[PDB]
Design a protein around this ligand. Structure first.
Ligand SMILES: COc1ccc(OC)c2[nH]c(=O)c(CCNC(=O)c3ccccc3I)cc12
Length: 279
């Protein structure tokens, strides 16, 4: 039986396999994450509650389909996905995901704490992300992340590896939607503003992640809103921070990755083959 010495169980999956605990693990955007338990296995999981929002019919179906496909997936540099379903308690409805639990939190958090990365760490972590992306891209059908950022790359441990999270949630990003000016303005790949993407959207995102890691700032901080950024991205204007990359080989890789024309970008295969990533 579950002892509730400090923490009460406050929710369950339909079959009661998964339990939610009233310990919040983290908050970001349109989700809160709780400590959970897989009672089959006695293994702690993340109980992620996505903000109550009305989804369109298409969004609901895209998501349930993509979720299914995540279910079996196991790779060192991917955060495992277990299940998801609609949930309510009192007056609040939400989507729950149960996933592997990453208690060391995000790359973003780390980069906020440690503003100078060692080349060795940048090399090894960027490589892991690429292995992750390559695993996704080679599923059947291929899984494209579509919203990769430091905010959804997770560290296993201060000296551990990284794992890509946020799998499948891009389906609920309203990339083509008008949106409120709040928080730091975001960019995306040129073609992604109109959702005409393929695997190369992840390459662009990867390059921007690498840039952020190398410079320790979010690209395009010189812009006040996402409209300004849009105009730059879709006109080939790089973020100021590009010019602050100290190390020639890193700058080259980033440059290969963040090209305006998606067809001109490095492939993942290229990148894993590159001297920089070949020790
Ligand atoms: C969401 O915000 C946080 C803030 C802080 C965290 O740790 C301090 C988090 N740890 C997690 O395991 C998680 C959940 C990780 N799981 C995933 O990202 C994931 C993986 C596959 C499919 C879907 C997903 I919301 C979130 C988290």
């Amino acid at each position: 039986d579950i002892e509730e010495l400090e923490t009460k169980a406050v929710g369950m999956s339909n079959d009661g396999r998964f339990l939610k605990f009233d310990i919040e693990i983290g908050r970001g955007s349109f989700k809160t994450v709780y400590k959970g338990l897989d009672t089959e296995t006695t293994v702690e999981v993340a109980w992620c509650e996505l903000q109550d929002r009305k989804l369109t019919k298409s969004e609901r179906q895209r998501f349930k389909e993509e979720a299914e496909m995540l279910k079996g997936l196991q790779h060192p540099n991917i955060v495992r996905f277990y299940d998801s379903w609609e949930s309510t308690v009192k007056g609040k409805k939400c989507i729950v995901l149960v996933t592997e639990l990453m208690t060391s939190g995000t790359l973003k958090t780390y980069l906020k704490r440690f503003k100078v990365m060692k080349i060795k760490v940048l090399r090894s972590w960027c490589r892991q992300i690429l292995k992750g992306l390559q695993f996704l891209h080679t599923r059947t059908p291929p899984i494209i992340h579509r919203d990769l950022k430091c905010d959804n790359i997770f560290i296993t441990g201060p000296t551990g590896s990284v794992k890509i999270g946020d799998l499948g949630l891009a389906t609920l990003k309203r990339a083509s939607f008008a949106k409120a000016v709040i928080g730091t303005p975001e960019f995306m790949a040129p073609e992604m503003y109109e959702e005409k993407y393929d695997e190369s959207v992840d390459v662009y995102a990867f390059g921007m992640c690498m840039l952020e890691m190398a410079t320790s700032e979010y690209p395009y901080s010189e812009c006040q809103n996402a409209a300004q950024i849009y105009r730059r991205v879709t006109s080939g204007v790089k973020p100021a921070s590009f010019d602050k990359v100290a190390i020639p080989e890193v700058k080259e890789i980033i440059e290969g990755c963040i090209r305006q024309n998606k067809d001109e970008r490095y492939s993942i295969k290229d990148l894993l083959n590159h001297a920089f990533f070949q020790e």
